[PDB]
């Protein structure tokens, strides 16, 4: 690992998001910021909110610049309205650089901030094409690269604990690493495999094959990417296109049929619990996602375990049972490879080479019999046809 200053700079959990500490303004104002590869705006709470114990105070920053422009961002989950400006931004546990970046000062929000998440803002790491108001508002990472010598690349190691973290534990626990400008080898085992970034807007990728315990889900691969497939740290679940979700659930139910689970479980709404330590991991199937490789007619696969797609949750009775929620859900906006999927891997966002790399995470949760995996190569034909076109 050559980036020790950035290793272990993340806190949080899949259910409430992973955040990195940042400073805004002069003198610096410290804020915890949600790492979101699924959006492109840098925005921070800038007015009192019931879920915020701190916020950006523009009148206290000598370097604050008002853009005299409003901004609105509607996410899948919630939304916020704010005021645009720029100011000096740093990442304490990151590259030792200070950059002037666009900042949306959040003045109004609905279902955006999360009670107890400990974060007060969001760092949209995707491309300008999806930035609000429009693509002229330069994203933070673009500013970082244009203004410094930092390589146009970042990597994420999201670490799920494999068990419930209470309010105090999640504040003291290391949730992962965001390596800005590089790849730290201590964060993964084995080889890194790269899939093409199809288009620079979201971190869009193409899934060419899906397996549940080695069994081909056998759908037209275009279904897997309808209307797109993205890598998104800002979403908890693996979200799948309606038809793929239905087929995936049917297959996961069949593989786990030795035990019956209530419909509420499969809807990702109700928890299932087992006596401490008795979770029957082995009855649940591994899920393999084949991704287009960088070599013509070649793919590789990432394999996740139920330790990734079953999300640890505290029993409504706080008992000693090990409880979980099914972290795979239905999408109407394409595949979303959320945090529970990213927790199994070290993910490299190689903007410079327009590719996303995957390697087995040194912190993924597993058992003595199975491990997450990244394997290749596989002969795969007509992968370009798996991509969706409106």
Ligand X SMILES: CCCN(CCC)C(=O)c1cc(C)cc(C(=O)N[C@@H](Cc2cc(F)cc(F)c2)[C@H](O)[C@@H]2NCCN(Cc3ccccc3)C2=O)c1
CB closer to ligand X, 77 vs 297: 77
Q: Closest separation between CB of residue 19 and ligand X, Å?
A: 10
Among 38, 121, 175, 241, binds ligand X (CB under 6 A): 38
Residue 36 annotated among the catalytic residues of the structure: yes
Q: Report the alpha-carbon distance of residue 277 to residue 260 in Å, rounded.
A: 19
Residue in 60, 66, 72, 78 binding ligand X, rule: CB under 6 A: 78
Q: CB of 15: closest distance to ligand X in angstroms?
A: 6
232 belongs to the catalytic site: yes
Among 3, 7, 11, 17, binds ligand X (CB under 6 A): 17
Does 16 interact with ligand X (rule: CB under 6 A)?
yes
Within residues 129-148, the interface with ligand X by CB under 6 A covers: 130
Contact call for residue 225 and ligand X (CB under 6 A): no
One of 87, 232, 322, 350 is an active-site residue; which one? 232
**Can you tell me which of 76, 173, 213, 298 binds ligand X, judged by CB under 6 A?**
76
Catalytic residue among 36, 184, 322, 350, which?
Answer: 36
User: Quick check: 36 binds ligand X (CB under 6 A)?
Assistant: yes
334 binds ligand X, rule: CB under 6 A: no
Among the listed residues 87, 142, 211, 232, the single contact to ligand X using CB under 6 A: 232
Stretch that binds ligand X, among 89-97, 233-241, 285-293, 373-381 (CB under 6 A): 233-241
Active site members? 36, 232
Residues that bind ligand X (CB under 6 A): 15-17, 34, 36, 38-39, 73, 75-78, 112, 114, 130, 232, 234-237
């Amino acid at each position: 690992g050559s980036f020790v200053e950035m290793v272990d700079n993340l806190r949080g959990k899949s259910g409430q998001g992973y955040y990195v500490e940042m400073t805004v303004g002069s003198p610096p104002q410290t804020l915890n910021i949600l790492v979101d590869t699924g959006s492109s705006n840098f925005a921070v709470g800038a007015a009192p909110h019931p879920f915020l114990h701190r916020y950006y105070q523009r009148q206290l920053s000598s370097t604050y610049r008002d853009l005299r422009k409003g901004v609105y961002v509607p996410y899948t989950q919630g939304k916020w309205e704010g005021e645009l400006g720029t100011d000096l931004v740093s990442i304490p546990h990151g590259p030792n650089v200070t950059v002037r970046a666009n900042i949306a000062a959040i003045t109004e929000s609905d279902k955006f901030f999360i009670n107890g998440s400990n974060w007060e803002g969001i760092l949209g790491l995707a491309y300008a094409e999806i930035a609000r108001p429009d693509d002229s508002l330069e994203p933070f990472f673009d500013s970082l690269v244009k203004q410094t010598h930092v390589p146009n690349l970042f990597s994420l190691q999201l670490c799920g604990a494999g068990f419930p973290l209470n309010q105090s534990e999640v504040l003291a626990s290391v949730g992962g690493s965001m390596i800005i400008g590089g790849i730290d080898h201590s964060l993964y085992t084995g080889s890194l495999w790269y899939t093409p970034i199809r288009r620079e807007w979201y971190y869009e990728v193409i899934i060419v094959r899906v397996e549940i315990n080695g069994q081909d889900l056998k759908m037209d691969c275009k279904e897997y990417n309808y209307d797109k497939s993205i890598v998104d740290s800002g979403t908890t679940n693996l979200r799948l296109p309606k038809k793929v979700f239905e087929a995936a659930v049917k297959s996961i139910k069949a593989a786990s049929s030795t035990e019956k689970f209530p419909d509420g479980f499969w809807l990702g709404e109700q928890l299932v619990c087992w006596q401490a330590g008795t979770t029957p991991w082995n009855i649940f199937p591994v899920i393999s996602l084949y991704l287009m490789g960088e070599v013509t007619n070649q793919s590789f696969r990432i394999t996740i375990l139920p330790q990734q797609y079953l999300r640890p949750v505290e029993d409504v009775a706080t008992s000693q049972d090990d409880c979980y929620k099914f972290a795979i859900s239905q999408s109407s906006t394409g595949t979303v490879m959320g945090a529970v999927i990213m927790e199994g891997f070290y993910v490299v966002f190689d903007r410079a080479r327009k590719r996303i790399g995957f390697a087995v995470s040194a912190c993924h949760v597993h058992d003595e019999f199975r491990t997450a995996a990244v394997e290749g190569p596989f002969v795969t034909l007509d992968m370009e046809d798996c991509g969706y076109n409106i």
